[PDB]
Amino acid sequence: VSGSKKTVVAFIVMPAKNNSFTVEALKGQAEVRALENTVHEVTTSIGKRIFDHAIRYPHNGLTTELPTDLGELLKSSDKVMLKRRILALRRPEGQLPPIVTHNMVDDANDLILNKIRQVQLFNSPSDRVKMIFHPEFLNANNPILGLDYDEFVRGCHLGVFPSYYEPWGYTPAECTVMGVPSITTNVSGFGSYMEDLIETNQAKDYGIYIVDRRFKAPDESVEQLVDYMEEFVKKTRRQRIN
Amino acid sequence: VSGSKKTVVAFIVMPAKNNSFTVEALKGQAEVRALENTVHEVTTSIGKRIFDHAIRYPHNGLTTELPTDLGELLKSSDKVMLKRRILALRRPEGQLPPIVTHNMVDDANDLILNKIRQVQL
Amino acid sequence: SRDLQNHLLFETATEVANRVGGIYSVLKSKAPITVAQYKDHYHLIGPLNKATYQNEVDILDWKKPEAFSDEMRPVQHALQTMESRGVHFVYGRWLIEGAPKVILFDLDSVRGYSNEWKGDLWSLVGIPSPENDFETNDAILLGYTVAWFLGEVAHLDSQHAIVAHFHEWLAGVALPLCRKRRIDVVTIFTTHATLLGRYLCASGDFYNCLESVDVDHEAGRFGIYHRYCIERAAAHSADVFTTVSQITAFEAEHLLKRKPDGILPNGLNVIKFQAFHEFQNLHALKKEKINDFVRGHFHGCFDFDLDNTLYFFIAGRYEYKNKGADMFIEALARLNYRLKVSGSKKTVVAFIVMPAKNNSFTVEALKGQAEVRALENTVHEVTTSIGKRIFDHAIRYPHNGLTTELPTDLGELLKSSDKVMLKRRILALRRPEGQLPPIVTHNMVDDANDLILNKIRQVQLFNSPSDRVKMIFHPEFLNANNPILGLDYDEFVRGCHLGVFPSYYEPWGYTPAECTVMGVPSITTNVSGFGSYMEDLIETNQAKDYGIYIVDRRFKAPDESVEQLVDYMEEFVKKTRRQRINQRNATEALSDLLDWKRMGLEYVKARQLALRRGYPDQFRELVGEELNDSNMDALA
Ligand SMILES: O=c1ccn([C@@H]2O[C@H](COP(=O)(O)O)[C@@H](O)[C@H]2O)c(=O)[nH]1
Ligand SMILES: O=c1ccn([C@@H]2O[C@H](COP(=O)(O)O)[C@@H](O)[C@H]2O)c(=O)[nH]1
Ligand SMILES: O=P(O)(O)OC[C@H]1O[C@H](O)[C@H](O)[C@@H](O)[C@@H]1O
Ligand SMILES: [Ba+2]
Numbered sequence: 001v002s003g004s005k006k007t008v009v010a011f012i013v014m015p016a017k018n019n020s021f022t023v024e025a026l027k028g029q030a031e032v033r034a035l036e037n038t039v040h041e042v043t044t045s046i047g048k049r050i051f052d053h054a055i056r057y058p059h060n061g062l063t064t065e066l067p068t069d070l071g072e073l074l075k076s077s078d079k080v081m082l083k084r085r086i087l088a089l090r091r092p093e094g095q096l097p098p099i100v101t102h103n104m105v106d107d108a109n110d111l112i113l114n115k116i117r118q119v120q121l122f123n124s125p126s127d128r129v130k131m132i133f134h135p136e137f138l139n140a141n142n143p144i145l146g147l148d149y150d151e152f153v154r155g156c157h158l159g160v161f162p163s164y165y166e167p168w169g170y171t172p173a174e175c176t177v178m179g180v181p182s183i184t185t186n187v188s189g190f191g192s193y194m195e196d197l198i199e200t201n202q203a204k205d206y207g208i209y210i211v212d213r214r215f216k217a218p219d220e221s222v223e224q225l226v227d228y229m230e231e232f233v234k235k236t237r238r239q240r241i242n
Numbered sequence: 243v244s245g246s247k248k249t250v251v252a253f254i255v256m257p258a259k260n261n262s263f264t265v266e267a268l269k270g271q272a273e274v275r276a277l278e279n280t281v282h283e284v285t286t287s288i289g290k291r292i293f294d295h296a297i298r299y300p301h302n303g304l305t306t307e308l309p310t311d312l313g314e315l316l317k318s319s320d321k322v323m324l325k326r327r328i329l330a331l332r333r334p335e336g337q338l339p340p341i342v343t344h345n346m347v348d349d350a351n352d353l354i355l356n357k358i359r360q361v362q363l
Numbered sequence: 364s365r366d367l368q369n370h371l372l373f374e375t376a377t378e379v380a381n382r383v384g385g386i387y388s389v390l391k392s393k394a395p396i397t398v399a400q401y402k403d404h405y406h407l408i409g410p411l412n413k414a415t416y417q418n419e420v421d422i423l424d425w426k427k428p429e430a431f432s433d434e435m436r437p438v439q440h441a442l443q444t445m446e447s448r449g450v451h452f453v454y455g456r457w458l459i460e461g462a463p464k465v466i467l468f469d470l471d472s473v474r475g476y477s478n479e480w481k482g483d484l485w486s487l488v489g490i491p492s493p494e495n496d497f498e499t500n501d502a503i504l505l506g507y508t509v510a511w512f513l514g515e516v517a518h519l520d521s522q523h524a525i526v527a528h529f530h531e532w533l534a535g536v537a538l539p540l541c542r543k544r545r546i547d548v549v550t551i552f553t554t555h556a557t558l559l560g561r562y563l564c565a566s567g568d569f570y571n572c573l574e575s576v577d578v579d580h581e582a583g584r585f586g587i588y589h590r591y592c593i594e595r596a597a598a599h600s601a602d603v604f605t606t607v608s609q610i611t612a613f614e615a616e617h618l619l620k621r622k623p624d625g626i627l628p629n630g631l632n633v634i635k636f637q638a639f640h641e642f643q644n645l646h647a648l649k650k651e652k653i654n655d656f657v658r659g660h661f662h663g664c665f666d667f668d669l670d671n672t673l674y675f676f677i678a679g680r681y682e683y684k685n686k687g688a689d690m691f692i693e694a695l696a697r698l699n700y701r702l703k704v705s706g707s708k709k710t711v712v713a714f715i716v717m718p719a720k721n722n723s724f725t726v727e728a729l730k731g732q733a734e735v736r737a738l739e740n741t742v743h744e745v746t747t748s749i750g751k752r753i754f755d756h757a758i759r760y761p762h763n764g765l766t767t768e769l770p771t772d773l774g775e776l777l778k779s780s781d782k783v784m785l786k787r788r789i790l791a792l793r794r795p796e797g798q799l800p801p802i803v804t805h806n807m808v809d810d811a812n813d814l815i816l817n818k819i820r821q822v823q824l825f826n827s828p829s830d831r832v833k834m835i836f837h838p839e840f841l842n843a844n845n846p847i848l849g850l851d852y853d854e855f856v857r858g859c860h861l862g863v864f865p866s867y868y869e870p871w872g873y874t875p876a877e878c879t880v881m882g883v884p885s886i887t888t889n890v891s892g893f894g895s896y897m898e899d900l901i902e903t904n905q906a907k908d909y910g911i912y913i914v915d916r917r918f919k920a921p922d923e924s925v926e927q928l929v930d931y932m933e934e935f936v937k938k939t940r941r942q943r944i945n946q947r948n949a950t951e952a953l954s955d956l957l958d959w960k961r962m963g964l965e966y967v968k969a970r971q972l973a974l975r976r977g978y979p980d981q982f983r984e985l986v987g988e989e990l991n992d993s994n995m996d997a998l999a
C-alpha cells in the first residue's frame with residue numbers, strides 16, 4: 001500500500017520433527033557457491049588484463065591510462081562459464097522460494113506452516129515480507145546456515161517475540177544483551193519487568209517494544225504489533241544503529 | 243633490420259665491487275607492487291558487481307545475463323587509484339632503464355660497463 | 364531603498380583559482396556552506412592565474428541571456444562595462460564541491476594604468492610603491508579593478524544590498540577605495556595574519572612585548588613598510604574588521620592598531636560517516652599499515668610489542684621554531700628519560716613529517732621493507748603446507764592410527780624445507796653488529812646542517828633498543844604512492860594516536876584542527892590560532908578529556924612550557940586502550956564545532972553587522988529597533 005521499497009526476511013527458529021534439510025536448500029546454496037568461485041576466476045583474469053594495460057601505457061599505441069571497453073577485460077570462455085552458473089541458478093517455471101528449509105515429518109498438520117499458507121505468504125516477487133521457517137535449533141555446523149544461534153541473533157535487525165505465557169523468557173533478554181532491539185509482550189515476564197523500569201514511550205528509543213496483550217483485544221494487539229513493526233521498517237541506517 | 247618483434251633481455255651475473263642496490267631498482271620493484279596490489283582491490287569490487295548482476299538477472303530489469311558497459315563495473319574511485327599507480331611508474335623525461343642494478347665502486351673503470359657503454363646498448 | 368534580506372555577496376582574496384597559501388583551502392571548503400545560502404547571489408573575486416586556471420576553472424559563456432536570471436542582470440551589464448574598457452577576465456565555475464561562481468580578472472589587461480594608480484595611492488592614502496616588488500604592484504592593480512567593478516554594480520543594481528568580503532592585505536587594496544570613493548556597498552576585512560607578526564617571530568619575545576613596539580619603526584626596519592600600509596589602511600577602511608582567532612585578534616589590535624569586531628574561525632568541510640564509529644574502525648586499519656612500516660624500519664632490531672606502541676606525530680611546513688619541532692624533540696628526549704626511570708613497559712614511535720631538501724628514500728629503508736615482504740610471503744607459503752597437513756589429520760582421524768583429533772607435535776606440520784627458507788628469511792632481516800634503526804628515511808641534501816637532525820643528535824635519540832621513545836623523520840609530505848609508508852596524509856593521521864603541534868606562531872593551523880576532525884587527540888598551544896579558540900570553548904581540565912591538550916607558551920618560561928608538554932605526553936602514554944578509545948570518541952564529538960556547518964554562522968554574524976552599520980535605519984526598521992553596534996556577538 002505505502003509503496004515501500006524495503007523488504008523483510010523473517011525467520012522462525014523452532015524445533016519440529018523432521019528428516020533434515022531439503023535437497024533444494026542444500027543444492028541452492030551449493031549453486032550460489034559455484035558462482036562466487038567462478039566470479040573469482042573471472043576477476044583474476046580481469047586483473048591480469050587491467051594490470052597489463054596499466055604497465056604498458058602509453059606504449060604500443062594505448063591512448064588511455066585505463067581500459068575503456070569491457071571487451072578488453074571480459075572474454076569468450078569467461079562469459080561462457082559465467083552464464084552456465086546463472087543457468088543452474090534459475091528455478092523451474094513459477095516455482096517459488098520455499099518456506100521450509102527442512103523435510104518435515106507431518107507437514108500437513110503443522111501449525112506454523114498451516115498458518116502461513118492460511119495467510120498466504122508464499123514468497124512472491126510482490127510480497128514485501130518473506131517467510132523462512134527453520135525447524136531446528138541453529139548450530140554453526142549446519143550446512144546451509146553456519147551460525148550458532150547467538151551469532152545469528154547478532155546478525156538480525158529486530159526480535160519479535162509476542163508472547164502470551166512466558167514467565168521470564170531468556171530469548172528477548174539475550175537479544176537485548178547482544179544489542180538487538182526487540183518486540184515483547186507485557187504478559188511475558190521479561191517484558192513485564194522492562195515495562196516497569198522505563199517509561200513506555202521512552203523504551204522504544206531503547207529498542208524495547210512492549211505490546212499490550214492484556215488490557216486489549218486479540219485484534220488490537222495484532223494491530224499494535226504491526227504499528228511497531230512498520231515504525232521500525234521506516235527507520236534509516238543512522239537511526240537503526242543509534 | 244629483419245624487423246623482428248622479438249626481444250632479448252640479457253643478464254650478466256658476475257660479482258664486482260659494489261655498494262648494494264640502487265634506490266632506483268628498489269623503488270622500481272615497489273611501485274610495480276603498489277600497482278599489483280591496487281589492481282587486486284579493484285578486481286575485488288568488480289567481483290562483487292559481476293556477482294550481483296549475475297545473481298539477480300532477469301529481475302530488476304537486467305536484459306543481459308552479464309554486465310555490458312564497463313562502467314557498471316568500474317567506479318571512479320577505482321579509476322582514480324589505478325591512475326595514481328600509473329603515475330608513480332612514469333620515468334623522468336628521457337631517462338632510459340639502467341644497464342646495472344647496483345652502485346658500483348669503481349664505475350668509471352669497470353670493464354663490463356665501459357664495454358656495454360662502448361657498443362651503445 | 365535597498366533590501367537587506369535578498370542581498371548579494373562578493374568575496375575577494377588572492378588565493379582563488381590558484382593555491383598560494385592557507386587561504387586557498389578556507390574559501391574552497393567554505394563554498395559548499397555559502398553557496399547553499401546564496402545560490403547565485405554569491406560571487407568570488409580574484410586575479411586570473413594565467414598558468415593554472417585552465418584546470419581549476421569551469422570556463423563559461425557569460426554573454427548568454429540564460430547565463431543569469433532577471434534580478435541578477437546588474438552583473439551582466441557591469442561585466443560588459445568592463446569589456447567596454449578592454450578589461451579581460453575569466454568567468455564560470457570553480458571545479459570544487461558546491462560549485463561556486465568566479466570572476467577572475469586578468470591583470471595583464473590593466474597593466475598600463477599602474478603608474479597612474481601607483482601615484483594615486485601615494486596621494487589618496489599615502490602608500491609608497493617601489494616597483495621592484497612584483498607583488499605590491501599586482502595587489503594595487505587588483506584593488507582598483509575590483510573597486511572599478513563594485514562601484515559600477517552598486518550603481519546598476521538598486522534592489523539588493525551589496526556586501527564585499529576581503530581576505531588578507533593583498534586583496535584589501537580596494538578597501539580604502541570603498542571609503543573615500545564612498546561606494547554604497549558594505550565591506551568586511553579579514554586578516555589571517557599580521558605582516559609584522561611574521562617578521563618579528565623570524566628572529567626573536569613576541570607575545571610578552573608587542574604592546575611596546577613601534578608599528579612604524581619595525582615595518583621600515585624589515586623593509587616591509589609599503590606592504591604594511593595597505594594592511595593598516597584595510598583594517599580601518601572597512602565596516603567590520605576581523606581576524607581568524609583570538610590570539611591573532613589580540614596582536615592585530617596592537618600591530619594594525621584597531622580592535623576586531625569579532626572572530627571568523629577557520630572551519631572545515633567535515634566528511635561524515637553513516638556509522639559514527641567508522642572512524643574507530645578506520646584507525647584500526649590505518650594503524651596496521653603504520654605497523655607494516657615500523658616492522659620494516661626496525662628490522663632485526665625489533666624488541667618492543669606493537670600492540671602496546673603509540674604513534675605520535677608532528678607535521679606541516681618546515682618551520683623549526685614556529686611550528687615548535689625544537690620543543691617536540693626536546694620534550695620527547697625528556698619523556699624518554701621519564702619512561703626509563705619509571706620503568707614503563709610502553710613504547711612511542713614519534714614521526715616528524717616536514718618537507719626538506721632530499722634525494723629520496725635510502726637504500727636501507729627500501730631493503731628493510733623489501734625484506735619484510737619476502738618474509739611475509741614465505742610465511743604464507745609455509746602456512747598453506749601446514750594447512751594441507753592439519754586438514755589431512757582432521758579428515759583421517761581416528762583411522763590410520765591417529766590417537767588425537769588434532770596434531771600434537773609441531774614436527775607433524777613443519778618440515779625441513781619449511782624451516783630452512785624461514786631461517787634464510789630471518790637472516791636477511793638481521794642487521795650489521797651495533798647498527799641502529801635510522802632517525803631518517805631519506806637521503807638529505809644537507810644532512811649536516813639540517814636543523815631537525817641536529818636537534819635529534821644533540822639530544823641523542825638513536826632508536827637504541829633501550830630507548831622508550833624512537834624517532835623517525837620523514838622529510839617529505841605523505842602520499843599513497845610511497846614505496847615504504849604508502850599512505851595519504853589523512854590516512855596516516857587517522858592511524859596515529861597523538862598529534863603534537865606545539866606551535867609558537869600559528870595564526871590558525873588546520874593541522875591540529877584536521878586532527879580533531881579525524882578523531883585524533885592533539886597537544887597544542889594557547890598561542891596557536893586553533894589552540895586559543897579551543898581553550899575558549901572549554902574549561903582546561905575538561906578539554907583534556909576531549910583529547911585537546913593546551914600547552915601554555917604565553918605566561919610561562921620556555922623551559923616550563925617544555926615540561927608541561929612532557930607532562931601531557933606522559934599522561935597520555937599511561938592510558939589504557941579502553942581509555943584511549945573513549946577519549947577518541949570524545950574528541951570526535953567535538954568535530955561538529957569545527958564544521959563550516961557551524962563556524963559558518965560566524966560569517967553570517969559578520970555579514971549582518973556589516974548590514975547594520977552601512978544602512979543603520981533600514982535594519983532598525985526590519986528588526987523593529989537597533990541592537991548593540993560595537994560587536995559581532997552583540998548583534999545576534
Ligand atoms: O537456535 C536456538 C534458539 C534458541 N536457543 C536458546 O534456547 C532457549 C529457548 O527459548 P525459550 O523456549 O526458553 O524461550 C533460549 O534461551 C535460547 O537462548 C538456542 O540455544 N538455539
Ligand atoms: O604529509 C602531509 C602533511 C601535511 N599536509 C597538509 O599540509 C598543511 C601543512 O600544515 P600547516 O603548515 O598549514 O599548518 C596541512 O593543512 C596538512 O593538511 C599534507 O598534505 N601532507
Ligand atoms: O590504537 P589503540 O588506541 O590501541 O586502539 C585500538 C582499537 O582501535 C579501534 O578502536 C578499533 O576499532 C579497536 O578494535 C581497537 O581495539
Ligand atoms: Ba537566502
Ligand SMILES: [Ba+2]
Nearest residue numbers: 898899900901
Ligand atoms: Ba568562555
